Design a protein around this ligand. Sequence first.
Ligand SMILES: CCCCCCCCCCCCCCCCCC(=O)OC[C@H](COP(=O)([O-])OCC(O)COP(=O)([O-])OC[C@@H](COC(=O)CCCCCCCCCCCCCCCCC)OC(=O)CCCCCCCCCCCCCCCCC)OC(=O)CCCCCCCCCCCCCCCCC
Ligand SMILES: CCCCCCCCCCCCCCCCCC(=O)OC[C@H](COP(=O)([O-])OCC(O)COP(=O)([O-])OC[C@@H](COC(=O)CCCCCCCCCCCCCCCCC)OC(=O)CCCCCCCCCCCCCCCCC)OC(=O)CCCCCCCCCCCCCCCCC
Ligand SMILES: CCCCCCCCCCCCCCCCCC(=O)OC[C@H](COP(=O)([O-])OCC[N+](C)(C)C)OC(=O)CCCCCCCCCCCCCCCCC
Ligand SMILES: CCCCCCCCCCCCCCCCCC(=O)OC[C@H](COP(=O)([O-])OCC[N+](C)(C)C)OC(=O)CCCCCCCCCCCCCCCCC
Ligand SMILES: CCCCCCCCCCCCCCCCCC(=O)OC[C@H](COP(=O)([O-])OCC[N+](C)(C)C)OC(=O)CCCCCCCCCCCCCCCCC
Ligand SMILES: CCCCCCCCCCCCCCCCCC(=O)OC[C@H](COP(=O)([O-])OCC[N+](C)(C)C)OC(=O)CCCCCCCCCCCCCCCCC
Ligand SMILES: CCCCCCCCCCCCCCCCCC(=O)OC[C@H](COP(=O)([O-])OCC[N+](C)(C)C)OC(=O)CCCCCCCCCCCCCCCCC
Ligand SMILES: CCCCCCCCCCCCCCCCCC(=O)OC[C@H](COP(=O)([O-])OCC[N+](C)(C)C)OC(=O)CCCCCCCCCCCCCCCCC
Ligand SMILES: CCCCCCCCCCCCCCCC(=O)OC[C@H](COP(=O)(O)O)OC(=O)CCCCCCCCCCCCCCC
Lengths: 8, 450, 120, 230, 168, 118, 26, 73, 125, 98
Amino acid sequence: GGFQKYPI
Amino acid sequence: SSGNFIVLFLGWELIGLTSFFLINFWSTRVGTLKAAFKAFSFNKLSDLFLFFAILIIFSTTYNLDILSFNNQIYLYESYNIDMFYWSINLIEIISFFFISCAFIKSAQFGAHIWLPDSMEAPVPASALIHSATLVSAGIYLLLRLSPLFELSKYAYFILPLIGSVTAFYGGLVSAFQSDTKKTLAYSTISHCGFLMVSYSTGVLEFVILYLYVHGFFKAATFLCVGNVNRFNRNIQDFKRMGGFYKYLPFECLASFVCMINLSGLPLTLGFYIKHLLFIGLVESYTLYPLIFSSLILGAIAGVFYSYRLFYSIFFDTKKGKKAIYLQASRIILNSKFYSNTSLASNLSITFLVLISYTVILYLYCTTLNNYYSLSDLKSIYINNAYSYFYKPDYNFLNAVSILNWFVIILLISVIYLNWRWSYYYTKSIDSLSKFILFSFFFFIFSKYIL
Amino acid sequence: GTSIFSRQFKKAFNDAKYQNLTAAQGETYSHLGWISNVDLRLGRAIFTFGVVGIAFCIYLEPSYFHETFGHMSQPPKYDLIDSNINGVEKKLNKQILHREHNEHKLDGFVSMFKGSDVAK
Amino acid sequence: GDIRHKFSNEITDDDYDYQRAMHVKPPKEESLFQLTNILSSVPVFKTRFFLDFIARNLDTNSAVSTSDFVAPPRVHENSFFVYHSRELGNVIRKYRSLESIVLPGALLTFTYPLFAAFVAIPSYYFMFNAKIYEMSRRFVVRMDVLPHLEMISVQRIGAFGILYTKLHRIQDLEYVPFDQVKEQENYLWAIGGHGVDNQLIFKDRSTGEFFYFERQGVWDAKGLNHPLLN
Amino acid sequence: NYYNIMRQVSLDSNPIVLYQSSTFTGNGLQEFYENADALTKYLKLVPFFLEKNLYDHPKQFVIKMEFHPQNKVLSLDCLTHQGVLKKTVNLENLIPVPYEDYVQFCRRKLFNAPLFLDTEMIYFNTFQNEFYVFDKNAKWNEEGINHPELDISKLYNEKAWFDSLRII
Amino acid sequence: GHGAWNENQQHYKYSKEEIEAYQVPMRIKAGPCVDTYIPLKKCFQENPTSFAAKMLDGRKGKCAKEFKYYNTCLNHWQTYENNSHVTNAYWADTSKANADGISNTYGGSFRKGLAWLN
Amino acid sequence: GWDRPDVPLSFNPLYVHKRELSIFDT
Amino acid sequence: AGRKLFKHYINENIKSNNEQKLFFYRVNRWRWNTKDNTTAPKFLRLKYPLLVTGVCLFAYDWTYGFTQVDAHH
Amino acid sequence: SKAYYFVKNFSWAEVSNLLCYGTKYPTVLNHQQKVTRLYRATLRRVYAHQVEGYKTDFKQYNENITDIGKDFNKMLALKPESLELQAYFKKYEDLQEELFDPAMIIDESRPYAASSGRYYIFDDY
Amino acid sequence: YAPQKVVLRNEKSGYYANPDDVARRLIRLISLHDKVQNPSAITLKSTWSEIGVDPLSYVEIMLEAENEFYIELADEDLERFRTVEDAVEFIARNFFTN
Ligand SMILES: CCCCCCCCCCCCCCCCCC(=O)OC[C@H](COP(=O)([O-])OCC(O)COP(=O)([O-])OC[C@@H](COC(=O)CCCCCCCCCCCCCCCCC)OC(=O)CCCCCCCCCCCCCCCCC)OC(=O)CCCCCCCCCCCCCCCCC
Ligand SMILES: CCCCCCCCCCCCCCCCCC(=O)OC[C@H](COP(=O)([O-])OCC(O)COP(=O)([O-])OC[C@@H](COC(=O)CCCCCCCCCCCCCCCCC)OC(=O)CCCCCCCCCCCCCCCCC)OC(=O)CCCCCCCCCCCCCCCCC
Ligand SMILES: CCCCCCCCCCCCCCCCCC(=O)OC[C@H](COP(=O)([O-])OCC[N+](C)(C)C)OC(=O)CCCCCCCCCCCCCCCCC
Ligand SMILES: CCCCCCCCCCCCCCCCCC(=O)OC[C@H](COP(=O)([O-])OCC[N+](C)(C)C)OC(=O)CCCCCCCCCCCCCCCCC
Ligand SMILES: CCCCCCCCCCCCCCCCCC(=O)OC[C@H](COP(=O)([O-])OCC[N+](C)(C)C)OC(=O)CCCCCCCCCCCCCCCCC
Ligand SMILES: CCCCCCCCCCCCCCCCCC(=O)OC[C@H](COP(=O)([O-])OCC[N+](C)(C)C)OC(=O)CCCCCCCCCCCCCCCCC
Ligand SMILES: CCCCCCCCCCCCCCCCCC(=O)OC[C@H](COP(=O)([O-])OCC[N+](C)(C)C)OC(=O)CCCCCCCCCCCCCCCCC
Ligand SMILES: CCCCCCCCCCCCCCCCCC(=O)OC[C@H](COP(=O)([O-])OCC[N+](C)(C)C)OC(=O)CCCCCCCCCCCCCCCCC
Ligand SMILES: CCCCCCCCCCCCCCCC(=O)OC[C@H](COP(=O)(O)O)OC(=O)CCCCCCCCCCCCCCC
């Protein structure tokens, strides 16, 4: 559904 | 809930700014910023008009209280303002500025260009702005300052014409539209036009009923299409949507109910708003032919967009990408928890629909019942429109039948009309013949043979 | 070797008529074998609520039917009070009641026409 | 691939059975209130009275087709049939038959026949005429060939379902490509031309009348191979 | 563009039986009535006949099927609410179809079918646009069905089997 | 009894102060049925009922005695406002209405639609 | 199933100017 | 007599149809699966909803149905 | 493709060139590139309008794509400097213009599309 | 939860999708074509011309590959592709959302 998580 | 014009202007600016933020939620993209800036420019123009109107009111009467202005405007109605080279009527100029700002914020014809571009916002924000929050500011202004517009020649001429033109334009564009959010936006424009025409008719109760019905069912439909888009991976066009009834069972039925209510259809809660609008429509307008034709076309346009949206989204042949269906059709996913939407989303939609039905019924009982029990509207203008709702005459009773049968024929067209070759062409023609003959015989027996 | 009317071949054809040839064997199926139970239950509940509302509209608000198809024949509705009396008594009372009904209709019409100036 | 059996509280096919109304699955068990179960259980339906009523008072097996080859009765003692329409012809016949019941009935029943006509006129001119009526007018119910005349007899459905046959010379028949008429009659082919074949349109040059042949129509190999038509 | 061209076929001398239902094995609707199993199966099929008639669903319950290899024609004995009828079908016009396709061909929600209606063995005649449904409680002649003329290597056509019937 | 459609059961006319007390919406106050409306509102206040009950009750339940007068007054008011009693007569028989003019003012301009040529 | 690598930096492709920004298009 | 007519044009149409490529059919077969799609009348079942409607209407008739006034027109 | 047809103030000719061929200057392309790109664009538009459309007819789609394929085979056979090939190119460019749809579906996998840059990815720096 | 310590981007493997599955699906799609005769002869190192894909059939196969893989391939990339190896590499390394 949502966008793939990426490091912050 | 503003007590004076200063608080009203503050709320106006705040809604403009917050709508700008909601539209520009995707701050990283500059394409969204263009739509946000378009909406911002229109909102600032409306702010200019509202500020100038408030300044005129303050200069005339040394007071900014809404109640005082409402109860004093009749004294100053006879006054005029000396402008550059023309002596403009004070009421006419004030109402002109108010109506300009109201049209800008309600997305009437000409000033509606920002509303289609405002759909870049996330679906919840779009529903909130388009249901009762951003696009009803003009309606609220008109209702609150009705004593001013009752003595406004400009309002009398402009509200019905612009309302009907916007209704027709939005209805037809929504019917021909292919994107869900754009279709809902143009339907909202059409309903805003209908609201303007109802206010011109001058039955505040009818205006309030129309506003409530439109807001509730527009919000519900927006939520349903948002679920559909999320399932379809942000593709809002239903040309890539097909056979979604099984993948989103709750959405299909919820959308069915919400759309039949929203689009004025017979034997639905949303039929009475249009019926009352046509009851109250005035006939002394010089442009009455155009006004009435536009109103009829806009009213009938609802069926086409409702049918297209519902059928194409759910029950049309599978047109979307193979992955959309395959990723969800895997047997491993089969479980008691399986769903393509949220349980909280489904419960929220169900509760919203139930509460909307209950509140609409309460308002209908309060207003349209034989015993009038609505609270005082603080207006002394009586339109006599309730006479044709209490004791309609044969002329009007048969006149409404024209629109009813137009809608019936359009429904038959959208149902039985074939645009593509199919194995069921001959059987569909046969079913149409069966339906026609059975309807005739059933009417014969019901009316005469019993 | 194989021929039509073979059960194995018929089952294979039934399963493979609408298969996804680009998928590996054993997972080349396109149909969904079930429906979300909770979503379907909620959808059916709301659909039933809407259908009940539409039916209540049809029943208690026949205005649309009246203005679109006309007033249909009404099923019989009457009271058997007149059957209590019999004979000349019944005949005379029935005639008096009929005359009273006609006079009442005329009185209503004339009163509606005359009372235009009641409100001063 | 399925792991529903690994959990005791997971949904089951017994739980999904309620979806058989909205979902198509092969039958598993018969409920007590099914039509089949009721008929097979209640002894009343086993009565010879009911059995004979079923046997007689319903569609007969005589009219049911018994072969893939059809030889309809010859129109003329010397003619031979070539083409015949099975289902679309009957549908068009039934649809046009409504003009003999609905129309007089509408006149004698409706309170406002003028209102009905005013509603019907635009309805006919848009979405109905091109939809059904013109296609029916140009539809070929049956085609036979008379060799002595070297002509072709074509049967057509008229107003109120009346059937009429007309003769056209074979020398006057031409093939009209669909490209030459698609732009002229886009709406007709858009909404009503699906039943008939688009690429097999012929017309009579002398009379300028078209011939539409049903896609699901039966053609005779001998008729097609006859030297007159080749 | 596929056209229904007729070839005027005729039956041969000695047919080969391919299908024989265990029930309805007797000859005549009177025999079916007098037989206990046949009567109950007929009652269970009564909704099948009702669907045939009122729902305009072209389908036939097939029993006692024979094959003529000399002319390559199938003779089918079909049971209807009135009695037993004889039909002739062409292998060129016979193709198989899924049970779900058979169900979806009709636009009306069919009555709950009985448990003796073989869903796997459902076939479709394209010339007649009709369905043939067999009985689960039946006997198949292995030697008859293994005839060379019935081989898929000769009766197979991808376009006709997979693309001829597109219900959508 | 034997009162006009505008009078109520008690033949009592309420004053401006009484109207302000039993505040009546301007929609009703404009018409002539204030006297018949006020008792109905008082009865409803004394016996409050739900909106569902109001919709589903064809006789207004407890407040039926006053509702009869209110309904009669409302019917007369709306009929006189829309001139429906004359319009319906002209629709039923235009020729007879012209023969014995019910209202020449409306008769001279009335024209039934061509579609409704019963 | 597959262990996807982190979101690529190509998701936001750097834009390189190849044309003069005319003052007339400010 | 060397005249193009029904047989010739039927053969031409058959040739044109045979000239089609089966690649598009093969790729698109999955779209028209009967196990995955149905019709709106089939999906929207009014059997039990109408039963609940009948129950509600019966309750209304036997609770508030008595207190209604006939309106003849 | 960057899917920036409606942005950057493209003229109609430039937009048509972008739609038919991936480049805004088709003259740079050679014969094979031109033919293949035009065929791909025509197939894409026909698929969009007659497969993912409003009540699409798959048989008509098949016929149309087959005719287009035959025509493009003939075009590829034809020499680059041929008036017949020029006529074919004009015909299919006109078809592309006719089927041009404002607000046409743009895949989310292409640049400048809706949702293209909703997220800023932080670098190792 | 992400640790409080600094964590850098982890490019596990350039492929965002299972390259073996991508290659097998692409080979099945290619074999589906009429011009293709022998599916067995197809390998990642086999050129389009030798496997039998004409230049015009290549664009059709690539359009259907785009439809199957839920991505859009630029004409530049399609022309740059010279072997099934390159095609599968590009498709597997492609981020489906760009
Ligand atoms: C408790 C006691 C009871 C109390 C009182 C109630 C008693 C009565 C209950 C009756 C319940 C409804 C019965 C419906 C059965 C349908 C099946 C059937 O009979 O098939 C045979 C035949 C259809 O045969 P077919 O072979 O399936 O058709 C060929 C098509 O190619 C085949 O189509 P396709 O597969 O190619 O796909 C196209 C699909 C297209 O389908 C649709 O677009 C919608 C399908 C909905 C299915 C029905 C669900 C239930 C909704 C209706 C609820 C009942 C309302 C009251 C009805 C009576 C009013 C007098 O077509 C259809 O589904 C057409 C058939 C459905 C007809 C019913 C339509 C009702 C809604 C009106 C149209 C909506 C348009 C907008 C879209 C909706 C969402 C915004 O059905 C018809 O008789 C068709 C009639 C169409 C014209 C209707 C015009 C009526 C105008 C006057 C009345 C207006 C009030 C109602 C509408 C108000 C808005 C909601
Ligand atoms: C002494 C004995 C006397 C017996 C008298 C018997 C009289 C029978 C008269 C029958 C009249 C015709 C009925 C036709 C129904 C179908 C209509 C239809 O589908 O048309 C549209 C049909 C298209 O619809 P479709 O959905 O596509 O069709 C699908 C199939 O129809 C499949 O459709 P479907 O399955 O989706 O839905 C069809 C359903 C339609 O149903 C309805 O719409 C009716 C809904 C119920 C209404 C209830 C009203 C009364 C009660 C009110 C509430 C009281 C509450 C009391 C207190 C409760 C407190 C808790 O049909 C029914 O009405 C079935 C009967 C209802 C049984 C349930 C009644 C309630 C029992 C009590 C409660 C318990 C319930 C079960 C358990 C619940 C869980 C706990 O259009 C057509 O093309 C029509 C073509 C014509 C077909 C005709 C087929 C039948 C031919 C029969 C020929 C005559 C045979 C005579 C035999 C004589 C032997 C002696
Ligand atoms: C305190 C007062 C409370 C008053 C409550 C008033 C309720 C008014 C409801 C109005 C309609 C709104 C419906 C909303 C959705 C709920 C209905 C629904 O899901 O419908 C679809 C559902 C199912 O929809 P479906 O068609 O999808 O389901 C088919 C699948 N199966 C077969 C499994 C059901 O309809 C039904 O289940 C039919 C119900 C018919 C019977 C109705 C009365 C039930 C009474 C239960 C209590 C009995 C007590 C007895 C005590 C005896 C003591 C000795
Ligand atoms: C989160 C959950 C919250 C609680 C959920 C509550 C559920 C909903 C409860 C609703 C209760 C009220 C039902 C009213 C039914 C309709 C009454 C009516 O027609 O009014 C006549 C009354 C009687 O009026 P009258 O006879 O005095 O005069 C009318 C005047 N003329 C003749 C000129 C028109 O009419 C009106 O006042 C006008 C009503 C217009 C609107 C009609 C809507 C019809 C559809 C009703 C849907 C009901 C909800 C869905 C079904 C619920 C089933 C339980
Ligand atoms: C300003 C001017 C306005 C003018 C408006 C004009 C409006 C009126 C138009 C009149 C149209 C007349 C149509 C005639 C139809 C017959 C035509 C014809 O010859 O076709 C032969 C056709 C075809 O004949 P055929 O010879 O091909 O075959 C015989 C029939 N078959 C095909 C089955 C073998 O036959 C019929 O259709 C016979 C119809 C007989 C019944 C006709 C009347 C039915 C309606 C009765 C009244 C309504 C119901 C009442 C119920 C009462 C219950 C108590
Ligand atoms: C006088 C010249 C000849 C006139 C021929 C009649 C018109 C052409 C044939 C019409 C056949 C269809 C009749 C359907 C009747 C349905 C019941 C009814 O309302 O009848 C009485 C009414 C009229 O009876 P009435 O005049 O007593 O009604 C009172 C007056 N009104 C309704 C205006 C308040 O029928 C109509 O209104 C019919 C209008 C003309 C329809 C023209 C074709 C469009 C419809 C296509 C066919 C399918 C329609 C299905 C409708 C289903 C229900 C919505
Ligand atoms: C002449 C008499 C006086 C009245 C004057 C006015 C005449 C009628 C004008 C009707 C205009 C309707 C425009 C609808 C546009 C909808 C567009 C849309 O969403 O796509 C099409 C959708 C279908 O969308 P779709 O998604 O299913 O497929 C679209 C397919 N393509 C793109 C190929 C077209 O709906 C239709 O197709 C229906 C519209 C066409 C049929 C119109 C029939 C009109 C019948 C008029 C009856 C008049 C009765 C008499 C009384 C009238 C006056 C009171
Ligand atoms: C964990 C808790 C979560 C929240 C739970 C909340 C549950 C709410 C359930 C009902 C909501 C829907 C009501 C029906 C729709 C509206 C109808 C309408 O317009 O009103 C008509 C009617 C109004 O009355 P009427 O319409 O019947 O007519 C009155 C008649 N006269 C005028 C004569 C007096 O209102 C209702 O029926 C609504 C219920 C009454 C109002 C209740 C308000 C107080 C709530 C107390 C509970 C507080 C809980 C706090 C939880 C905090 C958690 C953090
Ligand atoms: C003022 C008229 C009011 C309406 C009158 C309706 C009359 C109906 C009976 C007509 C009988 C004669 C038919 C002749 C056919 C023919 O060959 O007609 C052929 C001729 C010639 O057409 P061309 O000039 O195009 O060749 O038709 C005409 O000239 C036009 C007349 C059209 C008649 C249409 C009849 C059907 C009406 C349908 C209404 C909408 C649907 C209603 C529900 C089903």
